[PDB]
């Protein structure tokens, strides 16, 4: 119930949900502790272009971008 914890944790969780690494149903600090580096690597434009079928390879996606 510390006000600083509530304020800053809500801000951090909202930012993490906005960038897409967390889920709307996982809005707790424990799930932040669960995060990995592949979750952030999946949000790059290069991998997004490849996963949506615009490119046929990850390097092809990089070249297209």
């Amino acid at each position: 119930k510390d006000p600083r914890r509530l304020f800053e944790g809500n801000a951090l969780l909202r930012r993490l949900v906005r960038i897409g690494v967390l889920d709307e149903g996982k809005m707790k600090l424990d799930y932040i502790l669960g995060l990995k580096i592949e979750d952030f690597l999946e949000r790059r434009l290069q991998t997004q272009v490849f996963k949506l079928g615009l490119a046929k390879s990850i390097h092809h996606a990089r070249v297209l971008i």
Partner: protein
């Protein structure tokens, strides 16, 4: 060869970490004034579950009343208490086998 390993890298080792604690690790944590769970979380920034075997718990009991503080710390509800059916009490052999 275990499928969890990508050459020397353990992929199935996950942010919930299960840590096998040796008997002398507990005593030196007491000497250094370090709380067990809190100091492990400071090192890893993740949830850590310390684990105590029957072999390790037996060696603390054999130490006596001089080591009663370490015995109370080992029996902590957050800790994971796991059984072992070995011949002998030697805890270095037991921990190597689980690894």
């Amino acid at each position: 060869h275990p499928s969890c390993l990508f050459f020397q890298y353990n992929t199935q080792l996950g942010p919930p970490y299960h840590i096998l604690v040796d008997t002398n690790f507990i005593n030196f944590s007491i000497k250094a004034k370090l709380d067990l769970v809190q100091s492990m979380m400071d090192c890893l920034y993740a949830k850590c579950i310390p684990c105590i075997t029957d072999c390790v718990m037996a060696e603390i009991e054999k130490l006596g009343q001089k080591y009663r503080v370490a015995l109370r710390i080992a029996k902590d509800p957050r800790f994971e208490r796991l059984p072992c059916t070995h011949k002998g009490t030697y805890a270095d052999d037991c921990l190597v086998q689980r690894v």
